[PDB]
Scaffold this active site. Sequence first.
Site, PDB file in Angstrom:
ATOM      1  N   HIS B  68       0.804  -1.238   0.000  1.00 20.37           N
ATOM      2  CA  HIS B  68       0.000   0.000   0.000  1.00 20.37           C
ATOM      3  C   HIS B  68       0.832   1.281   0.000  1.00 20.37           C
ATOM      4  CE1 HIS B  68       0.143   0.010   4.521  1.00 20.37           C
ATOM      5  NE2 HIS B  68       0.028   1.347   4.376  1.00 20.37           N
ATOM      6  N   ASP B  92       0.095  -7.691   1.842  1.00 19.70           N
ATOM      7  CA  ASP B  92       0.486  -6.278   1.824  1.00 19.70           C
ATOM      8  C   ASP B  92       2.000  -6.145   1.894  1.00 19.70           C
ATOM      9  OD1 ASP B  92       0.227  -3.508   1.654  1.00 19.70           O
ATOM     10  OD2 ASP B  92      -0.434  -3.225   3.729  1.00 19.70           O
ATOM     11  N   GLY B 148       3.233   7.202   8.978  1.00 23.01           N
ATOM     12  CA  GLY B 148       4.548   7.135   8.362  1.00 23.01           C
ATOM     13  C   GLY B 148       5.391   5.965   8.805  1.00 23.01           C
ATOM     14  N   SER B 150       4.399   2.423   8.613  1.00 23.40           N
ATOM     15  CA  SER B 150       4.324   1.245   7.743  1.00 23.40           C
ATOM     16  C   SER B 150       5.759   0.726   7.377  1.00 23.40           C
ATOM     17  CB  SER B 150       3.566   1.584   6.463  1.00 23.40           C
ATOM     18  OG  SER B 150       2.475   2.441   6.731  1.00 23.40           O
TER      19      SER B 150
END
Lengths: 642, 642
Positions: B68, B92, B148, B150
């Site tokens: 993502h 993901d 921020g 991830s």
Amino acid sequence: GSVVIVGRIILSGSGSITAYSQQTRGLLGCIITSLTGRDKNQVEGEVQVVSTATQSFLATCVNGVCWTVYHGAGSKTLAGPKGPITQMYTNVDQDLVGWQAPPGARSLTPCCGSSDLYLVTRHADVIPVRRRGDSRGSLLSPRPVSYLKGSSGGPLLCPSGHAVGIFRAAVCTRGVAKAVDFVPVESMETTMRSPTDNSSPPAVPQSFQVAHLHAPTGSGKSTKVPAAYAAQGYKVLVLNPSVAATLGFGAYMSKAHGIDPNIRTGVRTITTGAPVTYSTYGKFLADGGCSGGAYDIIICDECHSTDSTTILGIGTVLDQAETAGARLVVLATATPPGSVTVPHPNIEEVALSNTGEIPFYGKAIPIEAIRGGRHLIFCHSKKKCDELAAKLSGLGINAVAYYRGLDVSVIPTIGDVVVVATDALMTGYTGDFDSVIDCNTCVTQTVDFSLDPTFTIETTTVPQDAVSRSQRRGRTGRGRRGIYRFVTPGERPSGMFDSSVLCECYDAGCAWYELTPAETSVRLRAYLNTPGLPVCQDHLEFWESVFTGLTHIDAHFLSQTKQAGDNFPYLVAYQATVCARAQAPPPSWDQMWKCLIRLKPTLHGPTPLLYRLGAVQNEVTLTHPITKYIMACMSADLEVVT
Amino acid sequence: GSVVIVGRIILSSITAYSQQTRGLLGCIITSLTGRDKNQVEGEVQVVSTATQSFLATCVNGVCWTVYHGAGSKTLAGPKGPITQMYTNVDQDLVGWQAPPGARSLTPCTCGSSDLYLVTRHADVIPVRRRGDSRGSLLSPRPVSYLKGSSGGPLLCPSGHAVGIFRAAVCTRGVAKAVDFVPVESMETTMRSPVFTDNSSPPAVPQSFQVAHLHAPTGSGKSTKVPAAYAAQGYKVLVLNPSVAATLGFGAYMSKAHGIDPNIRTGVRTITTGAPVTYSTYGKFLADGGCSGGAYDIIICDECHSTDSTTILGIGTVLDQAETAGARLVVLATATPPGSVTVPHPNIEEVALSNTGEIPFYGKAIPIEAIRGGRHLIFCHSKKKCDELAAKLSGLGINAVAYYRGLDVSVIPTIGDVVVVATDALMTGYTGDFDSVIDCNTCVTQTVDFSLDPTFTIETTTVPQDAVSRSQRRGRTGRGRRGIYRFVTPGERPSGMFDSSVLCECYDAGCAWYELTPAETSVRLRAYLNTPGLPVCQDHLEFWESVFTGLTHIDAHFLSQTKQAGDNFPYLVAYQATVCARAQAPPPSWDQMWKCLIRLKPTLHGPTPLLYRLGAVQNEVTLTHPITKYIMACMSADLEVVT
Ligand SMILES: Nc1cccc(C(=O)O)c1C(=O)O
Ligand SMILES: Nc1cccc(C(=O)O)c1C(=O)O
């Protein structure tokens, strides 16, 4: 970091006002042009699409001047053919800046005042506006405010294509833009037709006048200028944001210029009956403002300060001074609105790199930069100070942390030191240093009309401004040579504050100074209506309506929040009151809600939430009369930038 | 557009500090070249696209982060751009082979349940492991703190990697738990065959299986492959999003395969009794899903399509097909999730310059580009479609607008034309063109869990993704030489959709398909739980909970919101039902609330707002049981990316 033209909006030449956009520059071109200040691209059209690194907006040439808004451009230069173009016009108060238009720019001409108007948006939409006053128009079809964002500086054209003004803010009703606020074309003409300086103390006028003193550093604005006034046989009052500054002036003025002045602070008050008085804005407000003919001259010192006590204090002075027989009010600062940090001859300015043994804000401090001498390091927060001071002492450095809630005696007057301090340092402590190391960030509060149910006071870290940089950098190079070490160059613009601070003046009016919301509006109005002071969106009616409904606060909770010294003691005690009265828990169990800790076993169910002052962790109810009252206030016209 | 290491998070008791190794310019220039000759250090990288910033963690020589965030983007690296070695949209998860000089972290084996999350600000959040992919935050934090972060590591006390952060688990804006990609999923992805052949149709197995068909544009996955199967004596259902394509395939089998198939669409059904059926997804749904022993193979065509109907239709197949005596499900698409736009040998691709007499999206179209021939020009809105068609008809071009509302007979099947269309062209019209001119943007819908009082469905212009770009470009170059003209090479990661699409499914369930919210959950869970399809945040329990409370809908308002054909007929008609029953005005008198006009002078007071589907102009009340219900629904775990 210049402002760059990245495209333009082309208007029609006949019939209906239509427009189309043209993008002349990509992201790379923009960032390169922003750095060089050099734009060799040929300007076409009257309406420019302009960009900084952080935001994009519009600009409109009128009478050979390329016009935009202060809140978007700051005092930045424009990228130009021969290089950066300096601003010919900076007017913080009218929210208007202007550059001499470059070769091949065309101007719009001024609008026979028609009331049928047309706002050109950044996506080249032409929306119809009905003229409602000098600076207002109503949106025929109300739109979300998102529709108008980045359209600051756009033209309001009347049906001829002539310019009425440039767009500067949306007027909102619970999130919907119902009107537009613009900078009129007449304000541009006044700006271009005004005749200045302000570096010398104003002469005492015949009748009441407000005057500005933009004193350079080391020119005695707080000692020499009030002494000089008092020699001319004037009674002078010197108001400063800081107890430590106020006492140091008193002490210096008793010692050097002969006069033993009266001192008025919380910790120390003395009456000598001397013609000079040094006070804080807080003690002045606690004393009930202006007294019967005691002062001829009021020096409002550090008038760049945007803390609520300085704004309230200055406000009180401006509303009360003339009536109390003052001849002259001086608004004194080294750093007025629109002013920018420029090199200092006693200060070597050194960009902090990635090589160094101490990690600091993504870059690095070498130990040998702070091995020898007395040094000050600015950090945005308490945690970072406590962290850094521990890391540094571990390396055998005499590191002390200073921040709010601590006593100044921790910092030695004598020998080798590294003080790691928040901005609290500057009202807490008067000493200078061999170098300053500046994180170039600071904590601020921002209001959000979030309608969940009401508003949020949001705490955030921002880029520092021109006033911050210069004040922090000025803690070194005083009389001697100093070093200034930084993480980022460049500042955000000076002389602007959030609507959050207005809220905070009402809170203080209410918590500390026995002012009704009505009483505080008179003072704040005096502050906003006076030009050349820091500027804010006028949310005076809004905020007064909020505080008017907060009645029969618990005295005990308010004493607690007051003593604990945290932000918004009124709003916190007030939420607590509603909680305790409903036997409901606080929005969370953060340190903010500690007044309620005794009661914790007795408190159950959803919190009747009034507003958001932090994270809400407990379930919520929106049924309480006061939530509802504050929800109803949210219907107020709120002028917001876009 | 490569991903760019702009910094790093150095690891040590677990402590972290951050270093910034690149500025914005360096980032842009590096992102453009893919050469980052800066030496990689650490095991946590701070990385950046044009828009986003997040983290990458190195485990097992592979530099890992979130799909993502990073899409299918190459990583700038020493000898040019590193193409991704692993892509797992379902998990993901993306990996690039770690650049030389870049340490990996060792995986955590000893299942310690005390975990430590590393943020992009180098903070070390204690986290208690709950399951395989979840850890509870020891101190609930506002969602924005985790923004921020991830791709940042979940560490066990060893300093060994447990997994990488991918999502926050929210209660009313507060992150109380984290979602993460575990280290075992990385090994699985690693251990997986890098290229698996999905080019050819699978053999019909003895036992039920779901298979993927990734076949090139032109390879007859909707004609030649159902035909081949039927030749083997199998009964085939082919599901397509498009009424026009569904009819079109039946028209082509009659000719080139000697099968006159059954055809099922809203508008038109034909029952020939044949072994092949072509149905739309919506008709398949209207019919009541899978009938037992009717079909052996179900081919779900255009299975990358993320409209509500296709998602619901596909889920219905995955849930019902095995129990209905089918042996094979084929999920068929040329653009599977993670797929990137690639050269087409038939399509000359040419970027729009600023030269041309037709303004288009900041760039220009030359009149020589579209004078003569048959061209398709894609706009994001029908307003833009009308402006452009009017402009071109002035210029002497024979232009025509096409969108939702219009009948496809507007487009001439013969002779020179410029068609100015939205993506509605895709399902409505079947023809191809000499050139395609693409705006590279589309209108999307986005949920915001805004708590004012409940949620918002927001309409927004977004960059196109690889699927859209492909679909639009694919309208030229079919069996001849196309031109493809564009505004920007930018293309978002494919195979993802928003939570509002899940809302849309429940809405279509209730308005159209006579489905209880529990029935829609069964179907959407089959879709969600099947790998290799488009992906979404799991918010089925949430939407089911809201829709479950929406009882006793006014049938007359629903028939009207259905007939009107606009989005969320069930939500719209249900808001109207409450307004009418509480004898109160709609949120506005926007087109959306047309159902209420017969009742307009009887309707007064505040709107009982349930949710926001556009601007709310009227005053609002939160007093309605349904409003209080939907507010109680918002306390659910909401998994959001930060
Ligand atoms: N730099 C200063 C420090 C303390 C006092 C003064 C003053 O107002 O005399 C000054 C100055 O600006 O000269
Ligand atoms: N491009 C196509 C147009 C119509 C039909 C088909 C088909 O599936 O036979 C195709 C194709 O992509 O093969």
